[PDB]
């Protein structure tokens, strides 16, 4: 209720953290209607999100569902905690299902300054989120920040 | 206030989560008047809870306390999250005092499809919980599902 | 709303906790107008908050802000989680900044029971705190439970 | 040179952990010319070792190696550590490439005395293990003790 | 072979550390035959060891076995690490059985200065300890440090 | 014994961990004498160390002892482990004192393929580690790969 999709959306985007990057493979979800998390489930597959994950606040995606974010970190986040993040890049599917990448603005860690675009990560990076998402489904490939600022911008 | 003891209650109880397995001996409360989780207290001994503890919400006990549950996991789940689970038993003690087994449902966690009924864990399991509360208090054993499901329905 | 500073403040104190000791370093602040937690940062500093950090409910400091408490526990105790402490002294530093340090009340943990004062704790401790907020600022040096509990009084 | 494959091979076996279940993703591994582990790789992907993973010590497969074992366990267990285990089925893999799947002797942990053969296990757990070797490679199945201890006993 | 127990017997003591303290119930045990950590057992209890708990190298109680030391520390110590310590107490049981209590060397950590005799800790953690070995069996109780390095002296 | 300083010195280096990064302030360390690792100290800052930390084997550096390695890396790395890794960079200290600042070979992980010298790094990450080890002393800055190459063979 008293918090929306960013400061300065779509360059800078809040995000709701679901999941903690290197968590156990236990699947939480925010549910609007409890307005508390929920175990979603817990993963068939040993596989751990490559990346903290949540949703843009006040966002409705084509499902009706809020816009979901990979955050990127360099330690984990606590489900619950909001994170200021600057979007960088998405990774589009088939099941169509888009994931926006993003990393902590420049207040939040200077660490990631020099990524301005998906691309500014190692591909070894890249691949491991793309196989996640695949193997726990068509992968479609990476798009560029634009791209994702303009998918922000038409859930809104 | 937006979240019950169930989709399908008694077969199906929503639990919300106080403390996680495998956590260190503190032992978090729901405060109701407060509507935050309390450190009710460090534990004394050197013992953890054996399973994810929890309570059904919207339930009120012979204490007019809400049902306290164990939800048996292959992960911890962490406090304030709700899960979906089954009974499949309890734990009744005199210190009257019973503590619902559980586990998750087949849509949260296949792996413990096949328990039915508490007996089906194996007793090196069952007796562990028993010698937690006892010894963290007089243990009269384990009854079956139906009675779980029985006590359930008279706290709703 | 329904969380106070205190049962019998000064001399108890309501404290939720926003980082947990031995965390990773990530300074999560509880954010009024959002009413959730947000990652302030990450620490720029291979550094982790040496206690419990967090605010008493209420507070109202000189600089608009609650006051901030160190609690010292035995395990780290969630964000999010309200602590029953008991102020044993303050931290006084100039950027002017004090952080009370606390312990859990008896009935929470007796472990403290003989830390009345803060120069009842190792001065290997209490310098290890004055190191942490300083590095990662000029800090004046302790101050008694009773300057503590004075500033606490100040603040309501 | 102080250790062997086990007490009573087949039937039981000492396996040297390499790989904690449920730890980061680094592939450690046993340096015989080193006498020491060895940090063999990152994995590429996000996923985890479903079990402990490690070997039989003096065994040597077709390829020369050790056989290898995934141990399940309550816990996990440290590289480095020996564990008795019992061997209850293999997953059988074409790269050919076998992994034991054992579990703790009743000795050791009594959790795992029902489990006589694989299929003993949930069908959801067996699954995770053929899914995390095939995409961490064409998996052909899991086949019974009998072979497993068949396959210890031919790399005596 | 190349470790002794202690640089200066008794008052201080080498000790090596099979289990860390606050670590799971995996009690670890070196293995003089096979010169390695076994696991000797997963704890039938969901109970932890209250500190640090190894041996000292080159001891020799009644049993035949090392004498056993609990290391209290601010930070778990990792199992095959050796630590040097100097005793505070021991702990009597009959099953008779020892536990020289011990904390870190002034050089280690000066946290634990002021403890110079086992009653200087706690009585909550030191009935936590009697507790641990209990339950995990009849507790004569502690003794002082002069009976703990007499102890120590006649494992020589 | 077995083992050496490197593949393919300087280019390549065999590093054996103490410390794990993002680990408790428990500072670990090689003995020799013991061929055993041992806690020199508990830290006495609530500081950890900002990468994998450790030394190069049969190295000797003007002091006497081991050229000392920072690896960075995606994970921690258990004490004892060996990682293949190479050189980038150097931080050259008084209290003279030199750390290596070295990154997992491509063939450990391709993650850090991109970094051919230290200031390929964020300067944020670099000025972390700076910071750590003068607060944890005169910090004379970092030097290029080709510095750290040759004080590594002048070490062998």
Chains 1, 2, 3, 4, 5, 6 share one sequence.
Not at 66 to 84: E, K, T, Y
Not at 101 to 110: F, I, S
């Amino acid at each position: 209720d008293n918090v929306t999709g960013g400061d300065n959306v779509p360059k800078e985007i809040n995000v709701i953290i679901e999941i903690s990057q290197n968590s156990c493979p236990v699947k939480y979800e925010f549910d609007k209607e409890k307005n508390l998390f929920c175990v979603d489930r817990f993963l068939p597959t040993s596989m751990y999100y490559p990346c903290n994950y949540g949703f843009i606040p006040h966002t409705c995606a084509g499902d009706g569902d809020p816009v979901d974010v990979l955050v990127a970190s360099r330690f984990p986040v606590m489900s619950g905690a909001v994170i200021r993040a600057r979007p960088v890049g998405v990774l589009v599917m088939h099941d169509e299902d888009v994931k926006i990448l993003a990393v902590p603005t420049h207040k939040v860690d200077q660490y990631y300054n020099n990524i301005k675009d998906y691309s500014d990560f190692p591909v070894s990076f890249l691949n491991s989120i793309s196989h996640f998402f695949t193997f726990y489904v068509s992968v479609e490939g990476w798009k560029d920040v634009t791209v994702a600022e303009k998918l922000i911008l038409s859930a809104l």
